[PDB]
């Protein structure tokens, strides 16, 4: 299942989804980073290549592994790179994901879980990319090391939403 995360703001699933809707609407990021989610180096490279373009970014981690970090590595990404939101695709089902996510919510970060697998047709992921597109998304930044599945999906996404795709 997927988890979308935003940092704490001065400002349940239904209300929570609307808060993320409002966020993407106000932020209007120009880039989305697609990375595997294990190597921080890879995410670091792609983030730099986004600031270099003066693009605000969302991060999409396609093959995220929880390890023993309890999502502390996602929090560190907010701090170090200033991503407006982070999406992680996990091997967990929704109920376990919502459960595991409780730890990051304890720190003020808002997190919303929805069902799905990275390889499968996902309408919620389409809703996110579409809304990003509607609000000004310009480019997909493919970090080094992506699987051919994600690379191919990214190219189709660039074609669908009329985006530049950067490697």
């Amino acid at each position: 299942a997927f988890l979308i995360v935003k940092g704490p703001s001065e400002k349940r699933n239904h209300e929570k989804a609307e808060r993320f809707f409002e966020l993407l609407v106000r932020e209007g990021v120009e880039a989305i980073i697609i990375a595997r989610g294990v190597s921080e180096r890879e995410i670091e490279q792609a983030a730099k290549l986004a600031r270099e373009k003066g693009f605000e970014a969302l991060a999409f981690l396609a093959e995220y592994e929880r390890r023993d970090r309890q999502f502390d590595d996602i929090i560190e990404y907010f701090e170090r790179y200033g991503f407006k939101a982070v999406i992680v695709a996990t091997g967990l089902d929704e109920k376990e994901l919502k459960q595991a996510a409780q730890k990051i919510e304890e720190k003020g970060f808002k997190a919303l879980a929805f069902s799905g697998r990275i390889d499968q047709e996902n309408h919620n992921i389409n809703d996110i990319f579409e809304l990003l597109q509607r609000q000004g998304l310009r480019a997909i930044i493919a970090a080094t090391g992506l699987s051919e599945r994600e690379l191919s999906w990214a190219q189709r996404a660039a074609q669908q939403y009329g985006l530049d795709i950067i490697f």
Epitope: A17, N124, I128, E130, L131, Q160
Partner: nanobody
Framework: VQLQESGGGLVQAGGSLRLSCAAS????????MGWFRQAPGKEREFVAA????????YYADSVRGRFTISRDNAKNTVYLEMNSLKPEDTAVYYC??????????????????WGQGTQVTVS
């Protein structure tokens, strides 16, 4: 959210018919708009659905090629253009609203708001 269908009626096989559904409510609550249909004795089933921008549209296999969904967001109206109508297409057609990030467009349980239905009869 408030929804209201129009455009239903009687048509001959091979004939065309255009459905309209006027929606009130915001972009979040009506991000996805869909058409479902129900014949007597049968379950309400998915027909066609569109995202807000139309960049994602979904169709029942029984219906693609023949039916085309579209939206006029300025009026928050959704249309279903039905061509090459078949008698098996006879049913009450309902429009429905699915909030942003509401899950699969195919599943009627993901639509929180429903219209009152418009009868479509193909003889």
């Amino acid at each position: 959210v408030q929804l209201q269908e129009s455009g239903g009626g009687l048509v001959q096989a091979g004939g065309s018919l255009r459905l309209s559904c006027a929606a009130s409510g915001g972009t979040f609550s009506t991000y996805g708009m869909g058409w479902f249909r129900q014949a007597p004795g049968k379950e309400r089933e998915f027909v066609a659905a569109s995202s807000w921008t139309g960049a994602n549209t979904y169709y029942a296999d029984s219906v693609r090629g023949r039916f085309t969904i579209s939206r006029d967001n300025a009026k928050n109206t959704v249309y279903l253009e039905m061509n090459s109508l078949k008698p098996e297409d006879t049913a009450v057609y309902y429009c429905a609203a699915r909030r942003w990030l509401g899950g699969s467009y195919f599943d009627p349980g993901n639509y929180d708001f429903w219209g009152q239905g418009t009868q479509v009869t193909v003889s």
